């Protein structure tokens, strides 16, 4: 059992902070995300992250720039940005924080494409059932103008 | 020499209206476009087109939808939209007008990608000249911090 400096603890706490951060920015009861367990100190860290996330969300030019990348291949995008961010060989906490922020934006960009395809998939089932099982009855109503009548 | 109904006149007037319409929506003296020659009647038509172009520019949801298409292959996009617009086999002047409007938006979308690449091309020349001819002198100044000094 290592302290804060052990890689074990760094990866463990890193995953907790990151997940809590991305979930908080991802927020309909069906879409409720379970809280990440956090001791006091990790909690304070998450609070800090969330405030910085909110200020960064206010920079409209950053938001414009982020939305302009094509995330057809988001993994490629993620590793290019990360590599570039740290290419000069310098490190600071700001950059680590901004990297976490970029990861959360990639989740939301991925969803922006996943949700319409999810919708398309379920429409496929629904319309397929409608066509083979309900269309005959719907025709007897004179099509969807019948539903107009029904609703008055 | 056919009248208004001849295909000759239809294509000729069509090209004049279209070009005048797209140019007007494309508007720095270097970027000044020469007016299309128009008799009175074609002029009135162009006026009408320009007013409709302005109302359509005000529909933000249409603008959002247009900017969301990927014009990596704009010709493909153009013919898909056109085909779809007239797929039901109906015609009216509104649709012809809206098609002209879409063509003008495609010009602006193409430019949105052409301009940064034009910039990149000229930067290539400039930086290439800078690197081989000016860098030695710029180094003697201590790099671009020298220009800071120069400007005070």
């Amino acid at each position: 059992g290592g302290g804060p400096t052990s890689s074990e603890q760094i990866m463990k706490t890193g995953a907790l902070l990151l997940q809590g951060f991305i979930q908080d920015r991802a927020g309909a009861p069906e879409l409720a995300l379970d809280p990440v367990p956090q001791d006091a100190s990790t909690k304070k860290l998450s609070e800090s992250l969330k405030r910085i996330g909110d200020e960064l969300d206010s920079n409209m030019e950053l938001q414009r720039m982020i939305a302009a990348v094509d995330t057809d291949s988001p993994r490629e995008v993620f590793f290019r940005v990360a590599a570039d961010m740290f290419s000069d060989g310098n490190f600071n906490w700001g950059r680590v924080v901004a990297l976490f922020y970029f990861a959360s934006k990639l989740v939301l960009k991925a969803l922006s494409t996943k949700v319409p395809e999810l919708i398309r998939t379920i429409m496929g089932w629904t319309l397929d059932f409608l066509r083979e099982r309900l269309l005959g009855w719907i025709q007897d109503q004179g099509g969807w103008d019948g539903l107009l009548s029904y609703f008055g | 020499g056919g009248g208004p109904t001849s295909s000759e006149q239809i294509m000729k007037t069509g090209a004049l209206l279209l070009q005048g319409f797209i140019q007007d929506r494309a508007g720095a003296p270097e970027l000044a476009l020469d007016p299309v020659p128009q008799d009175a009647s074609t002029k009135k038509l162009s006026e009408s087109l320009k007013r409709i172009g302005d109302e359509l520019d005000s529909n933000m949801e249409l603008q959002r939808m247009i900017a969301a298409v990927d014009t990596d292959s704009p010709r493909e996009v153009f013919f898909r939209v056109a085909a779809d617009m007239f797929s039901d086999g109906n015609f009216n002047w509104g649709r012809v007008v809206a098609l002209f409007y879409f063509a003008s938006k495609l010009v602006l979308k193409a430019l949105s990608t052409k301009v940064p690449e034009l910039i990149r091309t000229i930067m290539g020349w400039t930086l290439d000249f800078l690197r081989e001819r000016l860098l030695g002198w710029i180094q003697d100044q201590g790099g671009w911090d020298g220009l800071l000094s120069y400007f005070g």
Partner: peptide, 20 residues
């Protein structure tokens, strides 16, 4: 695209650096 990605990274690096 490759230049859009570069632009984001360098703005993020700048945000990060300006946090200090």
């Amino acid at each position: 695209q490759e230049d859009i990605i570069r632009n984001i990274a360098r703005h993020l690096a700048q945000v990060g650096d300006s946090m200090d």
